[PDB]
Nucleic acid binder design. Structure first.
Lengths: 194, 84, 123, 72, 62
RNA sequence: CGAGGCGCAGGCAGCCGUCGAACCGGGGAUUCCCGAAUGGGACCUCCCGCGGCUUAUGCCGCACUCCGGGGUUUAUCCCCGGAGGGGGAACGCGGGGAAUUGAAACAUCUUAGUACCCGCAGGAAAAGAAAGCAAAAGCGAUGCCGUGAGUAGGGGCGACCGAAAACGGCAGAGGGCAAACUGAACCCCGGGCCGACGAGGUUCGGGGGAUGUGGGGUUGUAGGGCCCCCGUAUGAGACC
RNA sequence: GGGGACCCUGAGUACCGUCGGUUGGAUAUCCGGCGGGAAGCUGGGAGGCAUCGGCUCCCAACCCUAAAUACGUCCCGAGA
């Protein structure tokens, strides 16, 4: 029941449920907007809270705009064997959702990626909103539901991958079959896992 | 608040600065400035400095040529320090 | 006026002051729910006589559902241009995108009027 | 030279005794450069240590005094 | 260029390489503003590499 | 520790040390300039805009870029608070990614996710309490070692390539959200009282906060709400 | 503890289709990209092709995790 579930479910189909007029209306504004914009307040609150969101001092949400499509491989300095030659079907190991977390983290380096989600997409771009919190302010430290990120250890989590997009990208999603070569790390097996 | 004066040099050149020119030679701080050398002298020997010329030597030290006003002679100062 | 998407109609300024004035009497006398979700329950529960809705709310999503949800529920709803005023009317320090008067008191004649005025403004 | 004799002095007396010590050091080094007739390595070595001592003892005292007031 | 090496060589005269503000080796190329050894001017970081160079001196130091 | 010392370094000379050295430990003072080098540039130097203070010289504090909060002609122009960058012996985690070679040629394959390259963290990382496993029987986190096994399996089905589950071991540890239901009950900062100036509790001025702080709760659901009946905050830890 | 709707229970996710990368992973690896796209526990996934039935197990799309396991900067001890 209740308000949150209705919004979340209405966003699930972004084509129905009055989301479509909004998506179109905001997207002109967003294509205009710079590739990185800081926002004081959330968008899909309903989605953000489930990831972890609080509205205390030092919590930011930021829209990162990232390009559509995979990679496009560098040109050669030598010669190549026929399989390795290819450049136009290349696609990254990191997810586009992941790439946004890292973009956000470079821009503000004293603030750390809790999580992130998708705000929708056009033919040329995708937008992801990344949830950061500062892991230096006493404000976060006192509260024990978000105190984990504050620890010294926890910085630089986004690159190593420990976030939802980071974990999903790493292929740690099961502990069974298909998880016979990614255990416990990709490079515990030297790069085998994906 | 810092060491000003490293030491007197006394040489055959020193006697020429002292006698003709009325000037005294010192080895002083290697980060010096004129403004400082003049006032520091002024207080310490209890003298009037007309002028200061400086050169930083290829010996890693700085040599200061302090001209006194011809009332406070080089010779009276010179006698006290670097001679008995 | 401003704010689009779910705002079908413009509420005149004189209507809005009467609505905001009923909301203050409503907290003292009767009951009021403050905040988007409570208003959401209040409509689902059937508890709410009148829901009030702030125009400036950004993103729209928080808000978007309430006029068609309200239509099914038979609850009338009226639009306020500024949020800060609404939180303020509600009796609170911060703003509110949405509030619901759950059963008025001494406001009852005024709220019934606001409710008819809006339907007369637009069904 | 002992650290104790240095502590018995006042802060004002420490400044005047530094100027005098350094000027003595300046004067000996001029004698050495002229060519030694004193033959004590002592004077330059001891003065250098003595100069350090008056300054350290001095900085520490002002620091103590300043802290004392703040508490009381 | 090829032979006649004596006839050629009047430059080097001009200098393009020094004792570095950062490292102290002989490679702060005045023209680029880059130290070949340390990487000062070019980078915030010191130049260090798997091959290495920089490392080798450091191990050697140990 | 304590009776000679004054580094490697046996000289000459002189010195210091019972108000106890040299030496060893712990703590403290000073710790140039350049350097992430942060006010700006440089060939390791130089210049400069404020503000404090001494009569002056002298001297002390400051202005790159995030976040958090102010100030105001709100010039986004300036102020107070907290941070970032760079390094590091290997290891670790995440990205980019060859070829010589092998297949006696060589293109798929092989080298190999190797070499090399980027980002980044710690003292261990990561993984981690099953949308598991699948001898269908039996198990209830995860690393790691032995083994499975050079097995299944892949592959010009050529050369080569190549696991896991399980077992025996080792070491052992389980917990938090979102939501339902509540809705400002809350957090941060400063000051005081009460208290061994501590833990804790109380109150007073700001800031954050309904785009939701905080309470509840989390594999599995306990009716989650509202009920009842009996022990019924009776009772007793457990933690600081 | 049992009494009614049991709490609704995570989305571009699960899954499908198209191209790679990779892997031992075979139709039966994993990860990306491009297009499409669920369910309200009256539900979903899993047991090495697809689909339908029985049977057994288990809850992805939110988060953290000591210890046991790496190293040789440093100290000590050791040497067919």
């Amino acid at each position: 029941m209740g308000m949150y579930k209705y919004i979340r479910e209405a966003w699930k189909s972004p084509k129905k449920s009055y989301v479509g007029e909004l998506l179109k209306q905001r997207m002109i504004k967003w294509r205009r907007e710079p590739v990185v914009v800081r926002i004081e307040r959330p968008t899909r609150l309903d989605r953000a809270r489930a990831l972890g969101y609080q509205a205390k001092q030092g919590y930011v949400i930021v829209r990162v705009r990232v390009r559509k499509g995979g990679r496009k491989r560098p040109r050669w300095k030598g010669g190549r064997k026929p399989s390795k030659m290819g450049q136009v079907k290349y696609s990254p190991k990191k997810s586009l959702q992941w790439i946004a977390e890292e973009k956000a983290a470079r821009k503000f380096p004293n603030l750390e990626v809790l999580n992130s989600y998708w705000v929708g997409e056009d033919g040329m771009y995708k937008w992801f909103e990344v949830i950061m919190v500062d892991p230096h302010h006493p404000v976060i430290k006192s509260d024990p539901k978000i105190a984990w990120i504050a620890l010294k250890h926890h910085k630089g989590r986004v690159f190593r991958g420990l976030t939802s997009a980071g974990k999903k990208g790493r292929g740690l999603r099961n502990k069974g079959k298909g998880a016979e070569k990614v255990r416990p790390s990709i490079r515990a097996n030297e790069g085998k896992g994906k | 608040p810092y060491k000003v004066i490293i030491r007197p040099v006394v040489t055959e050149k020193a006697i020429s600065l002292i006698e003709k020119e009325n000037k005294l030679t010192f080895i002083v701080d290697r980060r010096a400035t004129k403004q400082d050398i003049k006032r520091a002298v002024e207080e310490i020997f209890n003298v009037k400095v007309e002028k200061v010329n400086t050169l930083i030597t290829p010996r890693g030290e700085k040599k200061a040529y302090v001209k006194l006003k011809p009332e406070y002679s080089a010779s009276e100062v010179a006698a006290r320090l670097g001679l008995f | 006026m401003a704010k689009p998407s779910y705002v079908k109609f413009e509420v005149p300024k004189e209507l809005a002051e009467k609505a905001l004035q009923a909301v203050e009497i409503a907290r003292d006398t009767g009951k009021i729910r403050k905040g988007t979700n409570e208003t959401t329950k209040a409509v689902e529960r059937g508890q709410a006589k009148l829901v009030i809705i702030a125009e400036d709310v950004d993103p729209e999503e928080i808000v978007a559902h309430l006029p068609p949800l309200c239509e099914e529920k038979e609850i009338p709803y009226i639009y306020v241009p500024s949020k800060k005023e609404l939180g303020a009317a509600a009796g609170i320090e911060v703003a509110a995108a949405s509030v619901a008067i759950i059963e008025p008191g001494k406001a009852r004649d005024l709220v019934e009027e606001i409710a008819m005025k809006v339907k007369e403004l637009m069904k | 030279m002992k650290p104790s004799e240095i502590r018995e002095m006042s802060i004002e007396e420490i400044d005047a005794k530094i100027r005098e010590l350094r000027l003595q050091l300046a004067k000996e080094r001029g004698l050495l450069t002229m060519g030694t007739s004193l033959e004590n390595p002592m004077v330059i070595r001891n003065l250098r240590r003595d100069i350090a001592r008056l300054l350290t003892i001095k900085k520490e005292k002002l620091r103590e005094r300043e802290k004392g007031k703040v508490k009381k | 260029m090829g032979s006649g090496t004596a006839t050629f060589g009047k430059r080097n005269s001009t200098p393009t390489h020094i004792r570095c503000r950062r490292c102290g080796r002989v490679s702060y190329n005045v023209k680029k503003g880059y130290c070949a050894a340390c990487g000062f001017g070019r980078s915030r970081r010191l130049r260090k590499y798997r091959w290495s160079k920089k490392w080798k001196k450091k191990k050697n130091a140990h």
